[PDB]
Write a protein that binds this ligand. Sequence first.
Ligand SMILES: Nc1ncnc2c1ncn2[C@@H]1O[C@H](COP(=O)(O)OP(=O)(O)OP(=O)(O)O)[C@@H](O)[C@H]1O
Ligand SMILES: Nc1ncnc2c1ncn2[C@@H]1O[C@H](COP(=O)(O)OP(=O)(O)O)[C@@H](O)[C@H]1O
Ligand SMILES: [Mg+2]
Ligand SMILES: [Mg+2]
Lengths: 81, 187, 503, 128, 470, 456, 35
Amino acid sequence: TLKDITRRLKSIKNIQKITKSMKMVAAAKYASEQSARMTAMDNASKNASEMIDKLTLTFNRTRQAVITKELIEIISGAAAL
Amino acid sequence: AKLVRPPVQVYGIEGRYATALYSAASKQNKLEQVEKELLRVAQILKEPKVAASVLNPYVKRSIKVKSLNDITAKERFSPLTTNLINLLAENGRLSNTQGVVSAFSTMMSVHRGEVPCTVTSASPLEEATLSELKTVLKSFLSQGQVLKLEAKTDPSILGGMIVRIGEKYVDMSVKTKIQKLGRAMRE
Amino acid sequence: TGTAEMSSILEERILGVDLEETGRVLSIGDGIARVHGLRNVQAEEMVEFSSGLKGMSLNLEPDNVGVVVFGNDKLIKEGDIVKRTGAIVDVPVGEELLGRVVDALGNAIDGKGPIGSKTRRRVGLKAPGIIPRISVREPMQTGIKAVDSLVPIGRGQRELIIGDRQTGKTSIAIDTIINQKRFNDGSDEKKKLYCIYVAIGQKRSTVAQLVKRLTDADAMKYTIVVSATASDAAPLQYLAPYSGCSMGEYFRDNGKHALIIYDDLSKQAVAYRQMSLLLRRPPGREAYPGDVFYLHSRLLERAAKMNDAFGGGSLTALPVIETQAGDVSAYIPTNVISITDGQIFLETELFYKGIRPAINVGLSVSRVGSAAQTRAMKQVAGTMKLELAQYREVAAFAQFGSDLDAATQQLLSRGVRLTELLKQGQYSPMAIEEQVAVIYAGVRGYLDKLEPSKITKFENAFLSHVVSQHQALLGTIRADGKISEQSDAKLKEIVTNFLAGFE
Amino acid sequence: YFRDNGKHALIIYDDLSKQAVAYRQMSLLLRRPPGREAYPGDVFYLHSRLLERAAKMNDAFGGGSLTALPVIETQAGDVSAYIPTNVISITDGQIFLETELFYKGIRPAINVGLSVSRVGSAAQTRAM
Amino acid sequence: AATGRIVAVIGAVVDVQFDEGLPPILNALEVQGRETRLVLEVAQHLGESTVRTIAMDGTEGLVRGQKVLDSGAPIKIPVGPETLGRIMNVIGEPIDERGPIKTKQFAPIHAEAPEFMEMSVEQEILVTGIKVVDLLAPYAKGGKIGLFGGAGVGKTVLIMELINNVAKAHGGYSVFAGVGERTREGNDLYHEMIESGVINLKDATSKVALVYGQMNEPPGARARVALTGLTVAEYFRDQEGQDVLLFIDNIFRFTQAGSEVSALLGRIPSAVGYQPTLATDMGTMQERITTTKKGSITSVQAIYVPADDLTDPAPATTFAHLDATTVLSRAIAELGIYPAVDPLDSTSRIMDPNIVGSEHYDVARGVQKILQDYKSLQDIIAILGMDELSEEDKLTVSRARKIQRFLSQPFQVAEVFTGHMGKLVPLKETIKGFQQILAGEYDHLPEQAFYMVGPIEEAVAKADKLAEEH
Amino acid sequence: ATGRIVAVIGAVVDVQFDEGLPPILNALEVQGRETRLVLEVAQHLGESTVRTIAMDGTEGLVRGQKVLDSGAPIKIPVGPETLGRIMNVIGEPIDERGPIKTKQFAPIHAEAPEFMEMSVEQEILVTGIKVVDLLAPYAKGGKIGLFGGAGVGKTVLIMELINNVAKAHGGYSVFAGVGERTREGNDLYHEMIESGVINLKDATSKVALVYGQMNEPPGARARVALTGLTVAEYFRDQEGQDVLLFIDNIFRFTQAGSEVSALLGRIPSAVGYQPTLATDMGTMQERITTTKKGSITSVQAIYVPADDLTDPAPATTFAHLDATTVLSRAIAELGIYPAVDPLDSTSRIMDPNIVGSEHYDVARGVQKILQDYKSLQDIISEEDKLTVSRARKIQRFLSQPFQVAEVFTGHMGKLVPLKETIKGFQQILAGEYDHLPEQAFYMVGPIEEAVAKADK
Amino acid sequence: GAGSIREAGGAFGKREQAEEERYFRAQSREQLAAL
Ligand SMILES: Nc1ncnc2c1ncn2[C@@H]1O[C@H](COP(=O)(O)OP(=O)(O)OP(=O)(O)O)[C@@H](O)[C@H]1O
Ligand SMILES: Nc1ncnc2c1ncn2[C@@H]1O[C@H](COP(=O)(O)OP(=O)(O)O)[C@@H](O)[C@H]1O
Ligand SMILES: [Mg+2]
Ligand SMILES: [Mg+2]
C-alpha cells in the first residue's frame, strides 16, 4: 500500500538522520566506548540509507502502479457507456 | 411538437425512423399509401443494382442522395416517403432502409389488429382440427383482432399442442405433463 | 443511435424555423445542453437560452452543440429555444471596477449599482509574445519578510503559493494586497499596484470576510474582487480566472501595474474537469482532460512585464494551489509548478512549530531572484540566505549541538536567530526599509547574545524605536534604495545603542 | 528452417521488452483491456508461442535444433515485474547482469548466485 | 398535470416517458399503483420525451408502462413549528407513527443559496464546555463546524455531547438530520431526546426536529435527506428569524449516494470513483447551510473519512466549506484519550488574537507548539531512549504528556463507556489550566492525574488521592 | 482540395472533404481567419472526414468554414537565413524582424536515414570544454542528456557549445524551445544577443531559434521539436555540417505527445502516457544521427518526474541517450564553472575501443582520484594528503573560462583541444605539478596557462 | 516528517512507546511518593 510505504520511508529517513547525528556526537566525544559508538552509528546510518534506497524504489513502483490502476478504472467506466 | 406514438414500439435506428414516419403519416392519415410505397421502395433497393449502388461507402453521399431522389420521383412516390428516403440518404442510414420498412410494416400490422399466433405440434396437424383450433383461438382476442397463425411442427413434444397467442401461452404438450409427473415423483 | 436522430426531428423532416441563429435543446443534464441547429455558432461563443440563462458553445459536433449552462438545469427543458449572441465571451474592464465585487462575468454582486465601465475585453485573448516583453526587473513588494528577502517577486513574475489546506496561503495573498497601500497613496506613479483577487469555489462567507478585511485595511479602493463561489456553475468557476486576467490585462496594457491572485487554481481545474467529463471528452490521469495543462498555461502566460515601447506596464500573477498531504507530484500541482517562475511553499509542521508564515525556505524558490529586489534588501538578504542554508545543513544536529564544535554551534545559533526574525504577524505588512533594518540587525550579529524567546520582542521594540526616532535614515534608505556607507554606519550606531539599552 | 532441415541455429531477440511495448501499443490502439502495467492479457502468449519454437529435435525429425537467447531489460534491477517474470516462466534459465557489478568493473557483470541453466548441465563437456 | 409511463428500470434509476408536458429537472414524480408512496426525482432530460429519474424508495415491483404523475414542483416537505418533536423522512412523511404533520406551509427541498449581500461577518465564540475544542479550535455562533473522523473514532459520541451541551443550553429550535447512518443510533437519539425533555411527546414544547434517511435507504433518499433537514432549518432561520442549530450525521453519505447513482445516470467516473459533479453538488448543498442577515444557523456536521485518508475527495472538498474543522485522530483514540481530537490538525477561523484575546491565543499556540516539539522529540526517544535527553527536553516531554492527558475530558454521554462522570468546563477555566501547565506549575504532579478530569482543581484532587493510595 | 469543418471539440477539428482526401500528417489551412490557423491531419475517420489537431487556438471556428489542403506536411523555411531568427512550429517569424527569405522549404515530417546511410563507427565530437571532452565525451550524431536547471549556468553552457561548435567544426546550431516559458524565451533571446551568438546586424549568427510556447495547444508543442529537427536536417544534408540541436525540454515533448494522444481519444498506457510513447520518441530521435553528408548532435534537457528515473518518460528517453552532462549546484557553490558534476556525468563512448586507451586511462584515473578524494573528505594519513592535493588540483583544472562570458567577467575564453586536455590531466596525475599552488589551475585553459599563472 | 518513527508503528515505534511509559511510570511513582 502506498501509505504504508510512505510511513516506512519517513520512519527510516528519521532513523538515518538521528544515527548520523549520533555518529557526529560520538566523534566529538571521542576526541574506546566512544569509538565503538561512532562506528556503530556510522553502520546504522549506512544500513538505514540502504533500506531507504530499496524503499524508494518500491515506493516509485507502487505509485506508478496506483496511477495506472486509477486510469484503467476511469477508462473502463467510460467505455461501458 | 407532439408526436403520435404507434401501437407497438420498435427501437434502434429502424425503430426511430419508423416511429417518425408513422407519426408523420397519421398526421395526414396516409398510412396505407406510404405502407405500400415503402414496400415498393424496399423491393426497388433490394434488387442488386440499387443495393450495390447505395451500399457502396466510397462513392460520395450526395451522389447517391441525388440518385435516390431521382428513383423515388421516377416511381411516383408521395412527398412523405420521398423526403423520408432523402432523410435516410443524408444521415447515411440507407443500409437501415429494409429495417425501417420492416418496423413500419409490423407497426401497421399490429395497427390492423394482427396477432402472431404459433401452434407447435408433434405431427402435421389435421386441417378441420386446425380450423376448429382457429375458431377456439379467436376467443382469446379483443375485438378488431385477427389471428396470423403459423404452425410449425416439433415432434419432440410427444403430443398435444403448444399455443402462443402473442405473449399468452398455454403448454398443452404431453411432454410437459410427463416432466411434471417426473418432478412430482422425484420430489 | 445519434443525438439528432430523435423521433421529433426526424418526423418534422418527414413532414417537411431558422436553424442558423437559433437552436432547440435535444437533451439537458448536469449543466450540459445538447442543442440542435445553431449551424452558424462559433466555438466558445456565448449563447442565450429561452429562460434567460446564458451558455457557451464548447463542443461543436456534426449534429448537435454541446453548451455549458451558466446556471441551474431546472430552467432548461427539452425543446427550449437557444439564440446566438454572435460574440465570444467578454467582460467589462477599466478603473470603474476598482472597489467592486463582481462575478465571473463582471456583474456587480455588492449592490452598489452597475459597473459604469466603457470598455470591454475578451476573456480569451492570447498572451504577449516574445518581443513585447522585457525582463522582470522591478520589485513587487509583499511586505512579508520571508518572501521579500528569500523568495523575492518581481513585477511581471508568476509566483505560486502552494501548500496544504489551512497553511496560510490566502493570508500571504491578502498581506500582499494590503501592503500596496503605501505605494497607492503616495505620488510615485510607477510604484502603484492595482490588485485583483479572484475567488474560485469558495464560500460566500469567506469572500465576505475577505472583503471586510480589505475594507478595514482600506485596500478595497484599488482592488477588484472576482468571485465564482462554490454554489456557482462550473462554467463560471472555469471562466472567473480569465475574467480577472482580462481586468488586469487592461492595466498591463495601459502602462500600469496589476497583481492578480487566483485563489485557487485547484478548484478551477476541478470545475473544468467536471465540464469536460460531462461533455464526454476523453479523460486522462485523475480523470482530467487532455488540455488542462493548456488551460492553466494559457491563463498564466498572460502575466507579463511589457517593454517601454508597449507602455512599460506589467501583470504579476500569484496562483494558489492546494496540495493533498504535501503531494506536489499530483497532476495539477505538477502542471502549475511547471508553468510558474517559482513557488512559495507552506508547511503544516512549520505552522505548528511557531513559524508563521510557514514558508519552507528550502523548498521555496524564485527563478527571477535578486533581479526582483532592491539593492538594500539584496545586500542583507544575500547574507541571510547563505546563513540560513548553512543552518539547514546542520539543523539535524540540533538537540545534540551542545556537544559539537564552535562552528556548528555558531551556525545553529545564527540560524535560530534568523528563523525567529522571519516570523511575522497577520495583516501587518512591513515597508522594505523596516525589513532591511531588521534583517541588518539579524545578519550582522547583534542578536547572537540574545535569547531566542526574546528575538520577537526585540524586533518589535527596535522597529517601533527606529520608526519613531529615526525617520531620517529610513527615508534615506527608501529614497536611495541602497544602504550607503553613511547609512550603514548610522544603522550600526542605532542598533548597537539600542541593544545596549535593550532589556 | 535450419531447425527442421537438420541444422542448428541460434537466435537472439534483442530485446523482447521493446517487442512487448510495441504489442502493448498495438493492443491499446485496438481498445483492448489493459492489465498489469497497461499490458494486454495475452502479452504472455505473445512471448510463449515464440520461445516455444526453440527446440531440440529427435533424430527422426532431423536432429537439428534452434537455440534462443531472448533479452529483457529491467527497471532498477526489478526482476519481479510483469514482463521479466513472464519470460522467466517461459525460458529454461536466465543470465542475470547486475549494474552494481558492472560499475565495479566486474565484466561480464554476471551474477553467479542468481543465474542458472536448468537443462544446460547435461550439455557441458567433460573437461569443462 | 402531466402523466408519463415507466420505460426502464435499472436499479434505483427509472426512466419515464411523457407524451404531453415534460416535467422540469428536480421535479418530484408520483408512481401510481403502489401501496406505499414512491417518489421519483427528475435528474436528466434524455430527449425523445424521456426523463431519467432517481427513486426515493425501492424500485422492486415497478413495471414498464406503469403510470407516473407529475407533482409540478420539487419534493415539498412540511415546515413550521409542527415539525418539532416529529421524525420525518426524505419526502416529509412522519416515521414516528404519531400521525400526519399538520403544518400551514410546505417548502421545496431545492432552493437557491443566499446571495453575497445576505452574508454576515459577525464572529462570536460559542463555548461548548469541551476543553480541546474551546481552547485550540473554538466554534462560532452561526458558523459551520464539521467533525472529521474515520470509523469508530468518536464522531457520533462527540455530536451527541454537543447536542446535549449546546442544544439544551440553546433556546432556538435545533434540527438533526440523520444522513445514511445506523438506525439503531437514530432510535437511541430519539429516546435520549424523549427522556431528556428535549422532545415532548405530550404537551408539545419540543425544540428539535428530526429528519432520518438511514443506510437501508436507496441512494436517492440518502442524497436528498440532507436537503430535507436543511429545508426545515432554513424555514426556522428565514421565516422566523430564529437562531437555529443544524446537526448532520453523516454528511459524507450525501456524496456517497451521489457516487452510487453517478454511473447509472450516464456519467464517466471521476477520480476515486466519485461523480464528476462532487464539488458542485457539495457546494449547492453546503452554501444554503449558512448564517444570513435574516437569521443564524449554527451547523455541526459529522464527516466520515474513508480509511482515515483526509485526502479523499469527499472530506478534502468538505474542508473549504467550514469555519471550524475538528479532526478526530485514530492514533489519539488508541492512546485512550477521548475526545480523539487532533490538536495539530484542528483549525478555527476565530482563533485570532483580535477575536478571542491574547491570553487565549497565546495559550493555544503554546500548547500546539509544545505538542509539535513533543512529536519531534519522540524520534530521538525512539533511537536513544528517554534517559539520554537533556533535562529541558525531558521537561518538554513531561509537560507535553501532561497537556495531552489534560486535553481529554469525560463526557456526559460517555458514562456507559468511561464510567467516569461528565464534566462541562468553562472557557476561562480551560485557558487557566493550560496556562498553568505550560508555565510549569505542576511539574511535581504525575501525568496520570490530568487524564479524564475537568478543570485543574480536579487534577490536583486526583493527584492527591493517587498519592494517598499509591 | 477544399474541405469544411464538421466538428470543433477543443483543439481537435474534424474536416470533411468532398474530393481529394488529404493524407495523414498533411497541414490544412483554415480560411477566413486574421491569423494563420493550421490543422494537421491525424486520422481518416471514414465518410470523407479526417480528424485533425490544431496548431493554434480554435475559438471562433464555425462548422462549415472552408479549409484548404496544403498538399504536404507543415513546411518551414530552411536555410542560412533562419540563423539568428525565431520561428514558431509552422515556420513563421515570431521576432518581428520581417519574413524569413529562404529559397526552399522542408516538410517537418521525414523518415529517418536509411540503414546504408549510417556511420559504422562512433567518433567523438570535441567541444573544447575540458570536463566534457575528458570525462563524458559527446559522440557525433548522439543524444546528450543535460541535467540540472536554474542557477548552474545551463544557458552559458548552451551558448558556449554553440560558439565552440561554430568555431571548431564550422557547424551551426538549432535551439528548439519545446514548451518554452515566454519570459525565459525572451531572456534566452537577449542573452544570445548579448553574447554575440545571435547577431541582429550581419549574417554572423550561429544559432536558429524555434519556439513552441507553453500557451500553445499540445499539437504545436508536439511538433516544435520536429520543426527544429528539420532546420538542423537541412544544415546537415545540404551543407554537410556537424550540427548541434538543442531540445529544451524533452520531457515537455513527451508531455505534449501524451496530451495530443489523450485528445484523440486513445487509451492511455502506464502512468497515463500515450500508448505510442516509444514510437513517438523513436521517430523523433532516429532523425538525430550521423549520415554520410554530416551529422546532428543533440543536447536535450532532461526533467525527471517525481525524481523517478524508472518513470516511462525518462526511461524511454534514456534508451536514446549516448551521454549525460550533470550540472550540479554542489559544484557551482564550490566555485567551479562550468558546474558539470565530473563523477555523475557519463558517456557511452568512454570506451578504450572508441576513444583510445590513452584517453580512457586518463579519464579513469581522474575519476578514481576524485572518488578517492570524496572518500577522504568524508573522514576529515601518509600519501592520502598527496591524493587530496592532486584531487584539489584536478578539481580546479576541470574549470574553464568561456568566451560567451568574456564581456561580463573580463577573462578570455578558452577552447582547449582534446590532446591538450588529455595530456594536461595526465601530467597533473603523474605529479609533474605537485609544487604549483592549487589556485594556479583555477579558471585556465591548457596546462601551460596553469604554469604561466603559477609564475605570477 | 516529525514523529514519523512512532506514526509508522514499527518495531521502533513500539520501542519508543515502551520507553516513554517505563520512564514516566518510574517518575510518577517517585512523584506520588513525595506527593
Ligand atoms: N502569519 C500568520 N500568523 C498567525 N496566523 C496566521 C498567519 N497566517 C495565517 N494565519 C492563520 O492560519 C489560518 C489559516 O490561514 P489561511 O486560511 O489564510 O490559509 P489557507 O491555506 O488559504 O486556508 P484554506 O485551506 O481554508 O484555504 C488562519 O486562521 C490565519 O489567520
Ligand atoms: N468521548 C468518548 N469517550 C469514550 N469512548 C469513546 C468516546 N468516543 C468514542 N468512544 C468509543 O469509540 C466508539 C465509537 O463511537 P462513535 O461515536 O460511534 O464513532 P464514529 O461515529 O466516528 O464511528 C464508541 O463506541 C466508544 O467505544
Ligand atoms: Mg484559502
Ligand atoms: Mg457514527
